[PDB]
Design a protein around this ligand. Structure first.
Ligand code: CA
Ligand code: CA
Ligand code: CA
Ligand code: TB
Length: 146
């Protein structure tokens, strides 16, 4: 069921959530990444999210706890319903077009440090008209063909 390739992609996320890297994920660290994802969860909401895999009585999300969680949540290529939700994250201008500048802003905020050329490569990957901007149609385009 769980392949090595999937585990490697999950471990990357765990390393992003852990700010000090103590092995567990508190509500503070959990809400830091969720904030840059266009979401705004409260203290009470962040607590319930942790309880999903918390059954040892620690109130945090350890390494094996997150791995199991990301396995049942991250399904790689999601449906169109979730695709629209993530599309509005990279497009903070709400115009429907995601340029290089916009994309690089969200990437750096997420914690992924990249250069300008790296962003231009991701943009042209989903771009069908080669205009530097990626709309909703082009967003799904990269989910069906790289
Ligand atoms: Ca940590
Ligand atoms: Ca925009
Ligand atoms: Ca376009
Ligand atoms: Tb725990």
């Amino acid at each position: 069921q769980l392949t090595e390739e999937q585990i490697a992609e999950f471990k990357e996320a765990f390393s992003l959530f852990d700010k000090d890297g103590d092995g567990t994920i508190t509500t503070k660290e959990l809400g830091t990444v969720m904030r840059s994802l266009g979401q705004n969860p409260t203290e009470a909401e962040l607590q319930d999210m942790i309880n999903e895999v918390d059954a040892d009585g620690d109130g945090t999300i350890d390494f094996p706890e997150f791995l199991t969680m990301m396995a049942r949540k991250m399904k790689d290529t999601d449906s169109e319903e979730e695709i629209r939700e993530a599309f509005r994250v990279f497009d903070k201008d709400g115009n429907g077009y995601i340029s290089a500048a916009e994309l690089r802003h969200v990437m750096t905020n997420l914690g992924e440090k990249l250069t300008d050329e790296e962003v231009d490569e991701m943009i042209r990957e989903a771009d069908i008209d080669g205009d530097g901007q990626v709309n909703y149609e082009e967003f799904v385009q990269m989910m069906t063909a790289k």
